[PDB]
Design an enzyme around this catalytic site. Structure first.
Site, PDB file in Angstrom:
ATOM      1  N   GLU A 258       0.786  -1.230   0.000  1.00 52.30           N
ATOM      2  CA  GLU A 258       0.000   0.000   0.000  1.00 52.30           C
ATOM      3  C   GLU A 258       0.820   1.283   0.000  1.00 52.30           C
ATOM      4  O   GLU A 258       0.738   2.065  -0.944  1.00 52.30           O
ATOM      5  CB  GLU A 258      -0.991   0.005   1.162  1.00 52.30           C
ATOM      6  CG  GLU A 258      -2.285  -0.740   0.882  1.00 52.30           C
ATOM      7  CD  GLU A 258      -2.095  -2.232   0.718  1.00 52.30           C
ATOM      8  OE1 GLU A 258      -1.046  -2.765   1.140  1.00 52.30           O
ATOM      9  OE2 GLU A 258      -3.017  -2.876   0.180  1.00 52.30           O
TER      10      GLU A 258
ATOM     11  N   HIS B  16     -12.564  -4.656   8.262  1.00 54.28           N
ATOM     12  CA  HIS B  16     -12.940  -4.520   6.858  1.00 54.28           C
ATOM     13  C   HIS B  16     -14.231  -3.734   6.597  1.00 54.28           C
ATOM     14  O   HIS B  16     -14.735  -3.747   5.474  1.00 54.28           O
ATOM     15  CB  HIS B  16     -13.041  -5.898   6.194  1.00 54.28           C
ATOM     16  CG  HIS B  16     -11.737  -6.632   6.120  1.00 54.28           C
ATOM     17  ND1 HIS B  16     -11.106  -7.147   7.231  1.00 54.28           N
ATOM     18  CD2 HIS B  16     -10.940  -6.927   5.065  1.00 54.28           C
ATOM     19  CE1 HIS B  16      -9.978  -7.731   6.865  1.00 54.28           C
ATOM     20  NE2 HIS B  16      -9.855  -7.612   5.556  1.00 54.28           N
TER      21      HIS B  16
HETATM   22  C1  LIG Z   1      -2.795  -4.197   3.872  1.00 58.59           C
HETATM   23  C2  LIG Z   1      -3.774  -5.070   3.067  1.00 58.59           C
HETATM   24  N1  LIG Z   1      -3.794  -5.012   1.715  1.00 58.59           N
HETATM   25  C3  LIG Z   1      -4.660  -5.772   0.991  1.00 58.59           C
HETATM   26  C4  LIG Z   1      -5.540  -6.634   1.632  1.00 58.59           C
HETATM   27  C5  LIG Z   1      -6.510  -7.511   0.840  1.00 58.59           C
HETATM   28  N2  LIG Z   1      -6.129  -8.935   0.983  1.00 58.59           N
HETATM   29  C6  LIG Z   1      -6.761  -9.912   1.793  1.00 58.59           C
HETATM   30  C7  LIG Z   1      -7.880  -9.946   2.680  1.00 58.59           C
HETATM   31  C8  LIG Z   1      -7.631 -10.455   4.080  1.00 58.59           C
HETATM   32  O1  LIG Z   1      -8.276  -8.638   2.975  1.00 58.59           O
HETATM   33  P1  LIG Z   1      -9.483 -10.394   1.860  1.00 58.59           P
HETATM   34  O2  LIG Z   1      -9.492 -11.856   1.226  1.00 58.59           O
HETATM   35  O3  LIG Z   1      -9.909  -9.325   0.772  1.00 58.59           O
HETATM   36  S1  LIG Z   1      -5.878 -11.365   1.586  1.00 58.59           S
HETATM   37  C9  LIG Z   1      -4.713 -10.822   0.472  1.00 58.59           C
HETATM   38  C10 LIG Z   1      -3.604 -11.636  -0.157  1.00 58.59           C
HETATM   39  C11 LIG Z   1      -2.482 -12.310   0.711  1.00 58.59           C
HETATM   40  O4  LIG Z   1      -1.723 -13.298   0.121  1.00 58.59           O
HETATM   41  P2  LIG Z   1      -0.804 -14.203   0.973  1.00 58.59           P
HETATM   42  O5  LIG Z   1       0.029 -13.254   1.805  1.00 58.59           O
HETATM   43  O6  LIG Z   1       0.148 -15.032   0.067  1.00 58.59           O
HETATM   44  O7  LIG Z   1      -1.670 -15.038   1.951  1.00 58.59           O
HETATM   45  P3  LIG Z   1      -2.267 -16.473   1.684  1.00 58.59           P
HETATM   46  O8  LIG Z   1      -1.854 -17.017   0.341  1.00 58.59           O
HETATM   47  O9  LIG Z   1      -1.775 -17.435   2.755  1.00 58.59           O
HETATM   48  O10 LIG Z   1      -3.792 -16.406   1.761  1.00 58.59           O
HETATM   49  C12 LIG Z   1      -5.018  -9.432   0.256  1.00 58.59           C
HETATM   50  C13 LIG Z   1      -4.156  -8.616  -0.700  1.00 58.59           C
HETATM   51  C14 LIG Z   1      -5.483  -6.669   3.058  1.00 58.59           C
HETATM   52  N3  LIG Z   1      -6.347  -7.514   3.825  1.00 58.59           N
HETATM   53  N4  LIG Z   1      -4.614  -5.890   3.713  1.00 58.59           N
END
Ligand SMILES: Cc1ncc(C[n+]2c([C@@](C)(O)[PH](=O)O)sc(CCOP(=O)(O)OP(=O)(O)O)c2C)c(N)n1
Ligand SMILES: Cc1ncc(C[n+]2c([C@@](C)(O)[PH](=O)O)sc(CCOP(=O)(O)OP(=O)(O)O)c2C)c(N)n1
Ligand SMILES: [Mg+2]
Ligand SMILES: [Mg+2]
Lengths: 362, 330, 362, 330
Positions: free
Chosen positions: D60, D129
C-alpha cells in the site's frame, strides 16, 4: 502387531547464512504418528465442512480455507511447546484448532453464533486462543505484532519463543522489513515464517516478487527453506529454529513451501490464475495426509484399516460439530456493545440513532 | 512556590509509573541516549537502562506494531511518536491492531498500550509537521484520546493513560513543553491521577461557555481576562479528554450561560468543534441556547511557513474575543 | 598557460551483485574543475549564511544544513543530464541550487518572503524546481515517490532516469523496501541513493541498523559504495549508475559515504552523540572542497589567484542574496488561501472563525 | 434506456477516461489479470495491456507513493485500494505527499491523482474490513472527497475525479456494485460529468430535509416512500461530494422544510453528520429550524460479525423513520 517407532529420511533444507541446518533423519513414534494423522485429518474435514456451510449461506462474509497446508499448522505445533507463542493472518482455522480450540467453537464462530470462541463478534478472520494472538485481517500487520510478542519473551526471560507467520503475498509488506531489522538488532526470539502457497490471492509469486527466495528476504537474518507438504520436515525444521532462538542467537526466517486446494477465499473459485491439473498434480503426489499415511503403513507403524477408522471417527465428529453450529442461537442483541474496553465501569454507547443505547460491559 | 514545566511534569509521570510497574517501558526515536527529541524523556535511560528505555530506528509502523504486540503479550508499553504527523505511517496498528482487538476477541485480549507525543501546531515547521489529529483518533471506538494543556493535566493524564488497560492516545503539545505552572503539593504525589473522561472548569463564569483543549485553553483564559474588564464573565472549560468527551459538564454550563463557543487548533471541517456543536443541538441543553454556537478553529489550509501567514492559521486571542462578542451581540 | 585536463586516481567502489564497477581513474578538464569548485563553494557559503541567519532569528522552524556533503550534490549533478530527475529529503538546500535555482530564491524561502521559490509557503524543507521534486519532510516518503518518478520515465520512453535519495536513518523505512521490490519487478530506471553521514538525527548507524552495509540492503538489487567526499569519485559513480539504468537493466543502489559538519538541524548542537575531534579530523583530512582545491593547483589546472578570485565573487553573490532575503517583503495576508487546488475557479476558505474568509486562487 | 449496474458504470467511466488520455493509468492489487477484486476493472487489462493496467504486490504505502510520484512527473494515475481499510497504511502518502504539495510548493506542483475503492460496511466482513473513511478524508485541506450512490453518481464522479488536476478520493461501495439503475442517454455519453462539490435532490419534499451520502441514500428514499403514505413528504438530498460539501443546497432546503436529519453509515463521533449540523448552526439557515437537527449513523462500535448484531450497527429504514418522527414530533 506394530512397530513402536521408525526412522525416516527427510528432505534437506536449503540454507542462508547457516553452516548447518536441521538433521536429515528423524524418529517418529507410533503414538506421535497417530496423533498427527488425526489432527491433520481433523483440520481437513473441518475446512471441507466450512466450504459446505458457506455454500448453504450459514457462513457469510470472509472464509479462508487452509486444506493442503495441514502439514504446516500441525508440523509447527509438533515442534513447539504450548508455552510458546504463535501468530498468523486470516487463514487460521487449522492453527486455531492446533492451539487448543475445539472444532465446535471454531465452526460456531464461523456461523456467527453465541457458542463461538468470540461469541460471534469475530467470524473467520478473528479468533484467539491461549498463546495464539489470532488471525489478523490486515496483510503484514501481524509480523511486527509477532516481533512484539518475541520482545516480551526476551523481556520476561522465560525462554519462550514466538512464531510469526505470513504469506508470500505478505512478504512484500514494508513493516515486515522494519521488523527484521529490529528483531535482529535486539536479538529477539522471533521465528519469521513465510507460508509460500505460490499465490497472493490471485497473483503468483513470479508476478509479485522480484526474488522468490523468501527465506533470503531477511538479508542479514539467517533462513532456511522447508518442504511444507511433509509433516516431518516441518516438525524437524521447527525444532531446529526454536532451538536457535532459545539459545539467544536471535531471529531466523523459515519458508514453508506448501499449497492451498481452494482459491483464496470462498468468493474465489481459483481457476483463472491456475489450472485444475496443477491442483490435481499436487494432491495425488504431495497431499500431506497421503504422505504420512504411506510412511506409517510402509513402516509398520499403523494399518490401513486403523487409519480409515480414524477417518470415520473424525468425519462424524465434524458432522456433530456442524449440527451444533447450525442449530446454536445467535448472540443476544443486548450484548452488541460489550467488550469495547477492558477493566472499565459499564457505560452506554450510541446505536443507529441517539435514542438507541447499548450497554457496554468489560 | 515550585514551578514545574509541562515537559518535566510528563517526565515525572512516566518516571513514577516506570518505578511502580516493571512491565511498563518506553520506546521510540531518540528517547534514550538523546534524552528525548524534546527532552521529555530526560534522565530516564540513565535511571532504567537499555531494557526499559529503548531507542528505535525510524520505523513507525514497525515499532508501533512491536509495541502493540508486547502489550498483547502482557507488557504495558509507552510508544512515542516524535510528532503525531509521523503516526500516520503506523495508524493501522493503532486502529486495527489495538483499538478493535478487545472487541473482536470478545473480551479475551486486552491491549494496555499508550501512544504519546506532541500533536498539532508548532512554530514555522510548515504543512507536514503541524497537523492536529484529535478528531481522527476521537472518531474511533476502542480508543481513548486525551489532550492535556498545563502541567497538572499532563502528569495526571499520562499516569491515567498508563494505568488504563486499553490503548490511550495522549496528544501533547510542543509549544506547551517549556511553559511553567504552579505545581501544587497534590500533583507532586505519586498517586496523582486525572480521570479520563472528566472536563475541568479553569474559570467560573455566567455569560458564555468557552470550551477548548490543549494549548488554546491558555488562550481562552487570556481572552476571558480581557472580557472581564468589560463586564463579560466567561466560563472556560478545559476538555482534557477527547474521547469519551465530557458533554455533561458542557451541557450544565450552557444551561446556566445560555451561550457556547468552541475553540480548537485543528482544521474546522469534521473537527472537535463539530462534534461538540452536534451534541449540544441533540441534547437537553439546546433549548437553553439564546444564540447559535460557533466554532473557533485553525484556518482551512495546510500550515504555511511564513510568520504572518502562520499567525493567521492559528486561533489568536483576538479571534476568540471576536467570536464571543458576536454570540453575545456586543 | 594551463593544462586542458588532468588525470586523477579515485577510490575503488565496493560492489554488490556487479561484475565490474566504475573506473579507478578519471579525467578532469580545466573548465569542469573551475565549475565544480564554484558550485561547491556556493553551496558551502550558502549553508554558512543560513546558519548565521537562523541565529539572528530571520529563519525559524526547521533548517537542515548540508555543508560537508558538497561533493554529493555537485557530484551527482555532474554525472547526470538536466533532463534527468532527482528527489531527496529535507536536507536539500544544495540540490535546490545544483538543479537550477538561485541563492536568492533559496534564501528568501528560508527567510519566508514572497520572493522565495515557494512564495514563503514552504520554508527550509519544501522547495521545488524543474525536475527537482523537492525536499520532503516525512522520512522515507520520497523513495516510493522517486520510484514513481522513475516509472514515468519508463512510461514516456525518453530515456531519462531518476535519482532517489535517502539518509542512513531513512534506510530502515518499510516503504523503501516496498520500492526496491516493485522497481526491480518492473525494471524501473531508478537510482536509489543512500547518503550515509553515519547518523540518523542522534542515532548512529550501529544503533539503528543490524547491517551497516547500505549498498547491500537492496538484496536482489545490485549496489555500490562510493566515497562521498571526493567530487570526482561521486561523478564517476553517478555516470556509471546512470548508464546502467539507461541501458534498461533496472534499478541500482548507490551508497555515498559522507559526513555533515552541523548537528542534523539548528535545534541540535550535535555534540552529545559524537566528539568534536571526530568532526575536525574529517574536516582536515577529507574536506571535499580542499581535496579538489589541492588537485587543481598541484596539477596545473588552475592558479591560487584564480581560485581566490572565484571565492570573492561567490562571497559577493551570497551577500547580495542575503540582503535580498532580509529586505524582501513577507507574503500579503490576502494570499494565505492561494494554491490549495490546481485548475479551479476561485472560491473562499475559512479562517480562524466563520467571519474570517480568505480568497483562494489556483 | 438500459439497466446499468454501479460496477459497470464505474468501469465505463474509467474505460472512457483511459481512451481519452494516454497519461491515465490504473494500478493496484488484482486490477489486471484477475479482472478486479470486485470485477470493477473487468476487461481493462485485456484492452490496454501491462502498461496501462498494473497489478502490484501488496504494498500500500509503496504503490500509493509510486502513484503520487508518477502524478508529480506529469502522469495521471488511478490508485485502487481493495478496500479503504487498507488505505490506512498509505494514508501518509495521500495526505502528506499528495494533498498538501500544491500549497507547499506555492502552486508549482499539482498532483493529478485519484484514490478509489470500496469504503464502509459490507456484509459479514467484521471490524477490520467495514470502516467508513468519509470524515477522515473530508477533514483534509487539499483533498477532494466524493461518495457516489447510484450508477449516474458513480460514472460522473469517477470521470470528474480523473479530469481534476488534484488528489481526489473516491469512496465507493461494495453492496452498491451489483445494483442496477436506469441509465439515461445523457449518462451513456462519454462526455458525462458530475461537478465535484454539488449536491443532488433525489426527491422533492416540504416537511423535512433528509441529507445523506453513499448507500444509505437508497435507505432514505425507502423511508420517504413509507412516510409519504402517512402524509409526510421528505426532501431527500444526496451529497455526492464530502469535501467541499454543498451546504447551500442543504440550507435552501432547510429554509423550506424547517427540519433536518442527516444519515451516514460511518461512526457518529466527528462524522459527516457532525459537520452538517455544525454548519447548520453557524449558517443563515439556523433560524429556520423549528426543531433541532438530529443524526442517524452507524453504531458507536467496531463492526461485529454476527448477522443480528451487524444489522443493528448500521442505519436501518426503521431508524430513519423513527428519527424523522421525533423531529417532526409525530
Ligand atoms: C494491507 C492489506 N492489503 C490488501 C488486503 C486484501 N487482501 C486480503 C484480505 C484479508 O483482505 P481479503 O481476502 O480481501 S488477503 C490478500 C492476499 C495475501 O496473500 P498471501 O500473503 O500469500 O496469503 P495467503 O496465500 O496465505 O492467503 C489481500 C491482498 C489486506 N487484507 N490488507
Ligand atoms: C516517519 C518519520 N519519522 C520521524 C521523523 C522525524 N525526523 C526528521 C524530521 C524531518 O521530521 P525533523 O528534524 O523532526 S529527520 C529524522 C532523521 C533522518 O536521518 P537521515 O535519514 O540519516 O537523514 P539525514 O542524516 O540527512 O538528516 C527524523 C527521525 C520524520 N520526519 N518522519
Ligand atoms: Mg499466498
Ligand atoms: Mg543520516
Amino acid at each position: 502387531s506394530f512397530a513402536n517407532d521408525a526412522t525416516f529420511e527427510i528432505k534437506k533444507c536449503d540454507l542462508h547464512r547457516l553452516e548447518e541446518g536441521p538433521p536429515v533423519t528423524t524418529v517418529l513414534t507410533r503414538e506421535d504418528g497417530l496423533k498427527y494423522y488425526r489432527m491433520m485429518q481433523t483440520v481437513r474435514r473441518m475446512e471441507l465442512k466450512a466450504d459446505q456451510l458457506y455454500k448453504q449461506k450459514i457462513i457469510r462474509g470472509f472464509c479462508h480455507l487452509c486444506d493442503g497446508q495441514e502439514a504446516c499448522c500441525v508440523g509447527l505445533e509438533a515442534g513447539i511447546n504450548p508455552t510458546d507463542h504463535l501468530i498468523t493472518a486470516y487463514r487460521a482455522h487449522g492453527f486455531t484448532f492446533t492451539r487448543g480450540l475445539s472444532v465446535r467453537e471454531i465452526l460456531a464462530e464461523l456461523t456467527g453464533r453465541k457458542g463461538g470462541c468470540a461469541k460471534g463478534k469475530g467470524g473467520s478472520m478473528h479468533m484467539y486462543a491461549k498463546n495464539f494472538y489470532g488471525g489478523n485481517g490486515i496483510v503484514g500487520a501481524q509480523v511486527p505484532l509477532g516481533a512484539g510478542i518475541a520482545l516480551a519473551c526476551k523481556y520476561n526471560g522465560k525462554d519462550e519463543v514466538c512464531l510469526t507467520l505470513y504469506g508470500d503475498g505478505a512478504a512484500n509488506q514494508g513493516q515486515i522489513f522494519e521488523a527484521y531489522n529490529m528483531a535482529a538488532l535486539w536479538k529477539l526470539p522471533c521465528i519469521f515464517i513465510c507460508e509460500n502457497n505460490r499465490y497472493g490471492m490471485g497473483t503468483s509469486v513470479e508476478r509479485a516478487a522480484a526474488s522468490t527466495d523468501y527465506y533470503k528476504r531477511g538479508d542479514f537474518i539467517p533462513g532456511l527453506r522447508v518442504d511444507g507438504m511433509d509433516i516431518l520436515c516441518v516438525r524437524e525444521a521447527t525444532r531446529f529454529a526454536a532451538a536457535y532462538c532459545r539459545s539467544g542467537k536471535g531471529p531466523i526466517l523459515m519458508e514453508l513451501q506448501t499449497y492451498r486446494y481452494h482459491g483464496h477465499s470462498m468468493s474465489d473459485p481459483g481457476v483463472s490464475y491456475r489450472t485444475r491439473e496443477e491442483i490435481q498434480e499436487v494432491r495425488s503426489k504431495s497431499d500431506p495426509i497421503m504422505l504420512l499415511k504411506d510412511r506409517m503403513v510402509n513402516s509398520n507403524l499403523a494399518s490401513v484399516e486403523e487409519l480409515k477408522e480414524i477417518d470415520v471417527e473424525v468425519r462424524k465428529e465434524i458432522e456433530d460439530a456442524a449440527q451444533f453450529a447450525t442449530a446454536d442461537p445467535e448472540p443476544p442483541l443486548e450484548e452488541l456493545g460489550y467488550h469495547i474496553y477492558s477493566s472499565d465501569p459499564p457505560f452506554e454507547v450510541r446505536g443507529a440513532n441517539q435514542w438507541i443505547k447499548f450497554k457496554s460491559v468489560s | 512556590s515550585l514551578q514545574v514545566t509541562v515537559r518535566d511534569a510528563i517526565n515525572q509521570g512516566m518516571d513514577e509509573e516506570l518505578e511502580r510497574d516493571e512491565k511498563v517501558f518506553l520506546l521510540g526515536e531518540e528517547v534514550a541516549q538523546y534524552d528525548g527529541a524534546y527532552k521529555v524523556s530526560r534522565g530516564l535511560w540513565k535511571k532504567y537502562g537499555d531494557k526499559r528505555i529503548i531507542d528505535t530506528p525510524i520505523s513507525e509502523m514497525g515499532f508501533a506494531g512491536i509495541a502493540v504486540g508486547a502489550a498483547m503479550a502482557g507488557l504495558r508499553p509507552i510508544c512515542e511518536f516524535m510528532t503525531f504527523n509521523f503516526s500516520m505511517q503506523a495508524i493501522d496498528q493503532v486502529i486495527n491492531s489495538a483499538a478493535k482487538t478487545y472487541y473482536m476477541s470478545g473480551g479475551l485480549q486486552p491491549v494496555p498500550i499508550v501512544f504519546r507525543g506532541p500533536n498539532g501546531a508548532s512554530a514555522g515547521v510548515a504543512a507536514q509537521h503541524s497537523q492536529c489529529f484529535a478528531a481522527w483518533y476521537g472518531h474511533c471506538p476502542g480508543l481513548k484520546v486525551v489532550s492535556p494543556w498545563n502541567s497538572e493535566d499532563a502528569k495526571g493524564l499520562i499516569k491515567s493513560a498508563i494505568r488504563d488497560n486499553n490503548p490511550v492516545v495522549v496528544l501533547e503539545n510542543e509549544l506547551m513543553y517549556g511553559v511553567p505552572f504552579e505545581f501544587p503539593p497534590e500533583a507532586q504525589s505519586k498517586d496523582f491521577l486525572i480521570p479520563i473522561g472528566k472536563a475541568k472548569i479553569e474559570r467560573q463564569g455566567t455569560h458564555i461557555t468557552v470550551v477548548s483543549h490543549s494549548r488554546p485553553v491558555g488562550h481562552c483564559l487570556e481572552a476571558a481576562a480581557v472580557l472581564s474588564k468589560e463586564g463579560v464573565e466567561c466560563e472556560v472549560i478545559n476538555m482534557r479528554t477527547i474521547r469519551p468527551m465530557d458533554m455533561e459538564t458542557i451541557e450544565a454550563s450552557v444551561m446556566k450561560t445560555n451561550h457556547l463557543v468552541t475553540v480548537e487548533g485543528g482544521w474546522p471541517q469534521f473537527g472537535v468543534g463539530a462534534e461538540i456543536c452536534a451534541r449540544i443541538m441533540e441534547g437537553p441543553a439546546f433549548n437553553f441556547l439564546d444564540a447559535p454556537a460557533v466554532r473557533v478553529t485553525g484556518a482551512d489550509v495546510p500550515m504555511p511557513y511564513a510568520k504572518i501567514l502562520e499567525d493567521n492559521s492559528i486561533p489568536q486571542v483576538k479571534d476568540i474575543i471576536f467570536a464571543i462578542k458576536k454570540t453575545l451581540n456586543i
